[PDB]
Structure 1
Amino acid sequence: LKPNAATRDQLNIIVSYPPTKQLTYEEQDLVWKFRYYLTNQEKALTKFLKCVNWDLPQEAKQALELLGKWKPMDVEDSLELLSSHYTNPTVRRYAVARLRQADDEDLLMYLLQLVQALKYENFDDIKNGLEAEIDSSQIITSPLPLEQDLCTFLISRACKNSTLANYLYWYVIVECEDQDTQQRDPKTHEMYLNVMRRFSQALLKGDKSVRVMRSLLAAQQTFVDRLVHLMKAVQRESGNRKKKNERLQALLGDNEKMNLSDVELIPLPLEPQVKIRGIIPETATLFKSALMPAQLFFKTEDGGKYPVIFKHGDDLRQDQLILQIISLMDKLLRKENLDLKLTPYKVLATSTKHGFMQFIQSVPVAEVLDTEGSIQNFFRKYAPSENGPNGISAEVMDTYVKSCAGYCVITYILGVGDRHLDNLLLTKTGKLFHIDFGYILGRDPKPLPPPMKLNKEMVEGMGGTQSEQYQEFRKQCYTAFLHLRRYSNLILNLFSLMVDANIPDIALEPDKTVKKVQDKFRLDLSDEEAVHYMQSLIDESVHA
């Protein structure tokens, strides 16, 4: 009923393990033995529930009396309980009970994963909450004249928060529209339709503002359906990029026919806090790309311009997951008082065949080099300073060093491949950032890719390997690395809820996907060994 000094050390080794590590039979027996002692350690509860054989009624019974007797679990840890591993209704209800403790800010960071976790819920209980044959896109547009589960909870919070409602809407829409899920997992497709029917029904039962949320959601779906129709017409248009652009601007201009240039204020699906009046027809063009994505400028509520990239005939879900992870990693780093001037641009899939991206005015590194000669020359042109380092503004140099460090570590951890200089972007304020995440988690079009994403010209832009800026780069690389290792339990749990998400590079090897991320962290190394390891990576990458 109480362990010795040696046993308490062995127990501490187990509790510290990543959520992925498989507890050995011997480790399991040790956790089951001192299960009453561990009740004071909130971080041990996850290790305890991984010992239980839920198929054995007596093991399940003992395990649940201890769950109510334990020190309440953290919010980051409750994400482990909502995975495919747990079927026990009492455990899954407990996870929702501890998630309820998070604020909406935190809930939005985890919501993409929470929609995926509905795949592990009781489908009948979802169906009973209601009071091909059904078109998912037409639910919201066709209105008719330990107690909460994941579906009830998410809907409860969505009805109180408009930002949360928008993302719950579009995330569930993409899930219903998934053809793979329709063919291979019909009962799952039926569940998602039921989450949408229950969402519509709850909004229709709400107050003045809650009923208007459903109108707004319908107006958004209708707008997106019209934009898709225009995209198909432009993509079909016979001729060159100019023929297609003229057709694009003409259809956008004809507001009576298409209703895209003049609309009553609606939330931009990509970022719902930004209300829009419509698309500016005149500045709308197609990108050179053979995929024919369009650049569209939205007229905002308060007289601004919000440039967007709308893609048609492409699945944006891989880029969506990566940009919400980059957004989360930036949020944890800022929490830890480290602002690395990162660019977590918004991405929102509106279906498996189309979606939005937030356009950030920038110049590819390739173009910078092939027009100005060097990054330092570019910076000297647009941001000069007499007193500044190398005749470049000090702020621009600090932004460039900080962003280079941030993306270097982030793209290392996420195993981002296909890293040429056309998909590495630079801003006149010094912001370096990555785009086009078609290859992640070790994948690359060419064989044996390098683990770190550095090059000659990048270090040149800092003022070479002998500069003070290059020293600060190193300091910021290893500092950010340690910070992200502290949040490894959170990062690994969110990646664990994505194993069945139909993300191409995840779908490849679902079983091996989370260990691929876990390895990058080098949790086997102490914080001091990690600092050296990160510098070895940098030095080996800069020299090669």
Structure 2
Amino acid sequence: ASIRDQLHTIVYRYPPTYVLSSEEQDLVWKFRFYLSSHKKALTKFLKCINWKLEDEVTQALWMLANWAPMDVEDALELLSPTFTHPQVRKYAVSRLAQAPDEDLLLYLLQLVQALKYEDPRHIVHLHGCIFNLCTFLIQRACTNATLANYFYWYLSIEVEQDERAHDMYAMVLKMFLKVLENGNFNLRGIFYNLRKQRRFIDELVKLVKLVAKEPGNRNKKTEKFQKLLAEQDMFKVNFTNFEPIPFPLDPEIYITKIVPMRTSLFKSALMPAKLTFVTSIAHHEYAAIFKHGDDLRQDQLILQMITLMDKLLRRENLDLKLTPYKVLATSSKHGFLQYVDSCTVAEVLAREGNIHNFFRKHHPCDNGPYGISAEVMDTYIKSCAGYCVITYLLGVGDRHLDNLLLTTNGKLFHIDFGYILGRDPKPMPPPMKLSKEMVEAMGGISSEHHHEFRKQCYTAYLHLRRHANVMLNLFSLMVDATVPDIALEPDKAVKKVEENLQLGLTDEEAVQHLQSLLDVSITAVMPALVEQIHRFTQYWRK
């Protein structure tokens, strides 16, 4: 029938997550033989025939083999725990094989997690062989230098009933380094580079340990810091100059040396340092942060997430001017974070009671809406929208004016991500996090900009909804991940992101929903709208 097609159109588009109708699950089977139509169908297909054990399986592998080629995201689902079978893993891996390197890089983080899934036998035999997914990751790590660095750092962290999963990761990392040694010139070139990175990290850790060990005023500890860096050959490789190393946090950039005098130390109780590095070429300086206190895996997942969303949005050709900095954690309790010149909002307010005066110093225009360049305002509005919607989907907690930073450009971003998926020290939300100052920085509900802001939020939300599947699959693979917040309710953890997505709603409904949350959050923050609500309560009483 022609109508059944609309109901099929329904199933291929709607879920990445359906359990629904393990009775209808075979109606698809009946029309699929002809409607091996397009890519998406196949993932849905595999979910049901597999439940029954045996003769259908052999028929299904043929069916799959002949099926229109799968998109990559299906493959991420195929690598998940749900399907145990090897051929489908093989198929999923051939899809990744088709994927370009940059794509692996984003996905890559989960793929390392994906290794936890079978088969150990595939791992044991490769290991036994020198003394399928794992094999593929290694080969492609060896093809690309940047890829190899990230692969290495992720494995080093996993090795640093989960004891058996550790064991496996250890075997996989060690093989990887061994193939590089046995390597032809370029592999070995990468290998030596990895060894060089590590040595350096270990030296910077040792310096930090010794900086922490002296009790002090913050200034005293910066003074001490500058002296240790300046001081030569007490530390295996001098810090004021060393052989050029490609930054571990960013492979593309090489570093010759740090600069001591430039380094300043952060207000946070456990104190990360800003360091200045020099690029191998043209004496560019790179500024990074080196944090000593906590495991950064959580911050980095969020950052990968943001990156993904921005990418899709830009592929949408909405640039919300998201400013997603790279984060890498070396070990649990050391990491590097990109640094972008920025002022924390609270700082701005101490420096200036208003954000607009703050912009006014940097990009003033006379016919400009407010004494700001029109384009700055637009960029500010967009960055807020993007970030409200992203935090929302991600259910980020603990926002405060120290947490959100502003650039002279107007981009707005969030710095610190200790609380994910709604976890929060405080007892209530708001679900949408906006300072009063930021809404006044928009010029309030009356203003035209604020309306543009709201408008952007909805449309961003609508788009992300469309690419539901990628985010859910990536998360599907963070269950066993060791992010503190996932670990508490891991099973539940995937559902929370999907709840925020509200995929159940038709679009108009979805926009309405987000409008709702916007209204609550804005009214709460503004003092004038709170007073108006009180007059309305007042009205029914008498």
TM-score by length of 1: 0.92
Q: Which runs of 5+ in 2 are unaligned?
A: 525-542
Residue of structure 1 in register with 2:518 after alignment: 538
* 1:334 matches 2:311: no
Amino acid at match of 1:289: S
**What letter matches 1:298 in structure 2?**
F
Deviations 1:377-435 (A, max 9, x none): 21112221112111111221121111111111111110011011110111111111011
* Higher mean C-alpha displacement, 17-26 vs 40-49: 17-26
Aligned counterpart, 1:192: 169
Where does residue 418 of structure 2 map in the other structure? 438
Matches within 5 A, 1:443-482: 443-482=423-462
Q: Is the 8 A contact 1:376 1:460 kept in 2?
A: no
**In structure 1, distance between residues paired with 2:242 and 2:375:** 40
Moved more, 411-420 or 379-388: 379-388
Q: Would you identify which runs of 4 or more consecutive aligned residues in structure 1 move more than 6 Å?
A: none
- List per-residue Cα deviations over 1:283-339 (Å, max 9, x = no partner): 223312221222111111231221111111311011000011111111111111111
* Aligned with 1:25 (options 5, 22, 31): 22
How much does 1:6 deviate? 4.2
Q: Does 1:164 align with 2:141?
A: no
What amino acid maps onto 1:187 in structure 2? R
Q: From the superposition, tell whether residues 9 and 394 of structure 1 become closer, same or farther in structure 2 (CA, over 3 Å).
A: closer
CA distance in 2, matches of 1:369, 1:239: 29
The one-letter amino acid of 1:345's match is Y
Aligned to 1:63: 60
Per-residue CA deviations over 1:452-477 (Å, capped at 9, x if unaligned) read 11232112112222222112212211
Q: Which residue of 1 aligns with 2:114?
A: 117
Question: Which of 309, 332, 356 is equivalent to 2:336?
Answer: 356
C-alpha contact (below 8 Å) 1:312/1:353 kept by paired residues: yes
CA distance 1:26–1:9, shift in 2 (3 Å): farther
What is the rounded CA distance, in whole Å, between the counterparts of 1:239 and 1:523 in structure 2?
53
**C-alpha distance in 1 between matches for 2:170 and 2:229:** 32
Instruction: Report the secondary structure of 1:478's partner residue.
Output: helix
Partner of residue 211, structure 1:
188
Structure 2 residue aligned with 1:295, among 274, 277, 287? 274
Separation (CA, whole Å) in 2 of partners of 1:116 and 1:30: 34
Q: Does 1:500 align with 2:477?
A: no
Determine if the alignment matches structure 1 residue 254 to structure 2 residue 226. Answer: no
What is the Cα deviation at residue 226 of structure 1?
0.8
Structure-1 residue corresponding to 2:534: none
Tell me how far 1:245 sits from its aligned partner: 2.0
Query: For 1:383 and 1:436, how far apart are their aligned partners in 2?
Result: 27
| TM-superposed deviation, 1:198 | 2.1
Q: CA RMSD in A?
A: 1.8
Q: Tell me the residue number matched to 1:233.
A: 210
Corresponding residue pairs, total = 519
Partner-residue secondary structure (3-state), 1:80: helix
Q: Which amino acid aligns with 1:155?
A: I
Q: Which amino acid aligns with 2:114?
A: A
Contact conserved, 1:130 with 1:197, CA < 8 A, in 2? Answer: no
Please give the secondary structure, in 2, of the residue aligned with 1:97: helix
Asked if 1:322 corresponds to 2:302, the answer is yes
Mean CA deviation greater in 150-159 or 218-227: 150-159
- Rounded to whole Å, the distance in 1 between the matches of 2:421 and 2:345 is 23
Deviation at 1:54, TM superposition (A): 5.7
Moved more, 234-243 or 81-90: 234-243
Q: Could you tell me which amino acid in structure 2 is paired with residue 337 of structure 1?
A: N
- Is 1:80 the counterpart of 2:77? The answer is yes
Asked if structure 2 preserves the Cα contact closer than 8 Å seen for 1:14 and 1:27, the reply is no
* Cα contact 2:265–2:271 (8 A) shared by 1: yes
Give the distance between the partners of 2:463 and 2:11, measured in 1 at CA: 22
Q: CA deviation at 1:244?
A: 2.2
Q: Residues 312 and 355 of structure 1 are in contact (CA less than 8 Å); yes or no, is this contact kept in structure 2? A: yes
Tell me how far apart the structure 1 counterparts of residues 262 and 359 of structure 2 sit (CA, whole Å): 28
Per-residue CA distance 1:14-44 (angstroms, 9 max, x = gap): 3223222213322323233334234223212
Instruction: Compute the TM-score of the two structures, normalised by the length of structure 2.
Output: 0.92
Pairing 1:274–2:256 present: no
1:242 aligned residue (219, 224, 227):
219
Where does the alignment leave 5 or more consecutive residues of structure 1 unmatched? 132-143, 178-183
Q: In structure 2, what is the Cα distance between the partners aligned to 1:152 and 1:23?
A: 36
Q: Which stretch shifts more, 57-66 or 466-475?
A: 57-66
Deviates more, 1:439-448 or 1:455-464: 455-464
Partner of 1:136 in structure 2?
Answer: none
Which residue of structure 2 aligns with residue 155 of structure 1?
138
Contact 2:299 2:418 in 1 (8 A): yes
Q: Classify the secondary structure of the residue corresponding to 2:460.
A: helix
| Whole-Å separation in 2 of the counterparts to 1:513 and 1:217 | 34
**1:414–1:441 contact (8 Å) kept in structure 2:** yes
C-alpha distance in structure 2 between counterparts of 1:496 and 1:173, whole Å? 23
**Segment of structure 1 superposing worse, 387-396 or 433-442:** 387-396
Contact 2:26 2:49 in 1 (8 A): no
Q: Where do residues 176-191 of structure 1 align in structure 2 (5 Å cutoff)? A: 176-177=159-160, 184-191=161-168
1:510 to 475, 481, 490: 490
Determine the C-alpha separation between the residues in 1 that align with 2:472 and 2:48. 20
Q: Amino acid of the residue matched to residue 89 of structure 1? A: P
Deviates more, 1:77-86 or 1:289-298: 289-298
Task: Say if 2:326 is the partner of 1:346.
Answer: yes
Deviates more, 1:323-332 or 1:453-462: 453-462
Per the TM alignment, residue 508 of structure 1 is displaced from its structure 2 partner at its CA by: 1.0
Q: Among the aligned pairs, what percent are the same residue? A: 63
1:39 aligns with 2:22: no
- In structure 2, the residue matched to 1:387 is 367
Distance 2:124 2:203 in 1: 31
